[PDB]
Structures are given as C-alpha cells and as structure tokens.
C-alpha cells in the first residue's frame, strides 16, 4: 500500500520546498514518518554547508517524493553532481556518501528523471591560531590574501579589513559555512568564552581558503596597530 501524507514541519529537510505532501514508502524505502523524519535529520548539518545548490532538491526527491504511484527518480547526473560537491564535506565530518545513494542506482540520461535544464569553503587543514605576532606580519598577511575580516565567535557581525568584492551578508554566510564544514577547526576556535579573531583568506576560483587566523586578545596592541595602518599601508 502507498499513501500520500503531509510533510510535517518537524521534517526540516523538506518542510519549505514548495509542495506540502509526500509519498510513502519513499524512494529510500522508509515506510512511515517515524522513520522518515530522523533519517532525514541526519542530513541537516550537511544541507547547511551550502555544498551544492541542488542538494536539498536531490534529497527531498528521495525522502519526500511527490504523490504519484510512479517513482520519479533523480537522474544519475544529478546524483553525481551533488555527490562530487558534498561527499568532500561529509568526509570532513568523518562521514561518507552512503551506499544507499551510490549514483549507479539512478538512471542514466534525462528521460523520466529529475535533472537540471557562492564561493565554496573546502575541507582544509586548520590554520594556526596565531597569538604572538607583530603588526608587520599581520600587514603582510593583509597584502597577500584577498580578504580579511574581524569576526567574533561564540558568530556576531563582521567588520571588513580588506573587503574586495565581498558583500557583508555573503561573507557572514561563507564564514559560518567554513566553520560548519571544518568542524575540527571550529572546535579549537570557539573555545568558549566568546573570542575575537582576524581571519585572512583567499577566494580563488571559486573556492574560499582561510590562510591566516589571528587571535584578538583583550589587551591587544598588534592587531589594533595593523588595522589602523592598513588603510595607508603600501604592499
């Protein structure tokens, strides 16, 4: 038996994707909502990393499929595109792309399947949290990297030192995505109490890479001096 049931608000994967009802069993083989919801919740961290714009579409088509008796599967090429961008993020959390989503289970081509007609943080080594630095070294970091920001983590409102093309909202989100991906690094940084850092990095093509992190301590002089002189500094 197959039934059409409303997507409950507690299913964060799919509670705001445009349609409101789903098929049981779903394409994952879950038979009831007590199974669907916690299994879907395993993906909540991943979906917040922004690793692929179609990640949520892809997963909802499997977890909350539309109410036909025919299964409309994602096309293999959609699985491959989402896997290739998001499996590196899973690996950064100690997880792997599940065998239940190996892309060979989905049809090749584009008939009867779901297909497609900003800079991304990557999993990287943790930057040293620098503490005994001179303002000269900070300024050289500002010259080299194409952005630098002052942020407070606990992650409050961000002050640009070297802004470039960056928009404030986008930069905030890029930082939070970097912290969510790089869980091991976040844990060293967000050692409560709330802490202030200067973060210098590079938005290459088209990835974000954090290269330098400077701890802004209570009675700092060197980051103060560096941020004051940056405006008039010559590289």
Numbering used by the authors: 24 to 140, 151 to 187, 201 to 281
Which of the paper's sentences describe this entry?
Sizzled (Szl) is both a secreted frizzled related protein (sFRP) and a naturally occurring inhibitor of the zinc metalloproteinase bone morphogenetic protein-1 (BMP-1), a key regulator of extracellular matrix assembly and growth factor activation. In most vertebrates (with the exception of mammals) this gradient is finely tuned by the presence of the protein Sizzled (Szl) which is a potent and specific inhibitor of BTPs (Ki = 1.5 nM). Bone morphogenetic protein-1 (BMP-1, EC 3.4.24.19) is a secreted multidomain Zn-metallopeptidase of the astacin M12A subfamily which plays a key role in extracellular matrix (ECM) deposition, growth factor activation and the generation of animal form. As a member of the BMP-1/tolloid-like family (BTPs), BMP-1 controls ECM deposition by site-specific proteolysis of procollagens, proteoglycans, prolysyl oxidases and other matrix proteins; BTPs also control growth factor activity, particularly members of the TGF-β superfamily, by proteolytic cleavage of precursor forms or growth factor antagonists.
